[PDB]
Amino acid sequence: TLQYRGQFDVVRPVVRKLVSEMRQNPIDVLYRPKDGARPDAADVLMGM
């Protein structure tokens, strides 16, 4: 047969909301010098 098979989505708006929420706050690495090391020991690595 075929019969009617409609799709009335109600979870896609939630997925879009969560994706946009996680996209509004970007996150990346941040290299920090170890304790007892030079205060600037991470600048070269961070720049690279």
Place this chain on the structure above:
Amino acid sequence: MQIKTKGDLVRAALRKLGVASDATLTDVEPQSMQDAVDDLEAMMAEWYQDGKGIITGYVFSDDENPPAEGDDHGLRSSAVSAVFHNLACRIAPDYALEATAKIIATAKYGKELLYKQTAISRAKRAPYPSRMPTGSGNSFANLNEWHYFPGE
């Protein structure tokens, strides 16, 4: 089946009515029997309304093959009782008679049972309308949005 022609159907109707039988010392004339065969043919044609009525398998006699009596009625095994009960009811007024209550009830029940299977087969649903989509669940994959294939 022991009943196999229109003549046997008419004889069974007469036996049920009590007018004539294999036991009676008097019998009906062949002209009366022929008239009863004509009554049966008319009744069956009125029922089987050129294909849109009760389907029974009845085989209509032709004018070239002379005696309508003696032609096999062509009915199934399960239709004989209903057909000859209804025939007895129809032809009873010829003999200043009135088919009794049991005969009437059996004729009604038999006609119902005759039409039951045809009614079940004729109770069908029309296809989907012309402005109905077929939904995303079908429309994905093959991109079909308005067909509603009549395959099954």
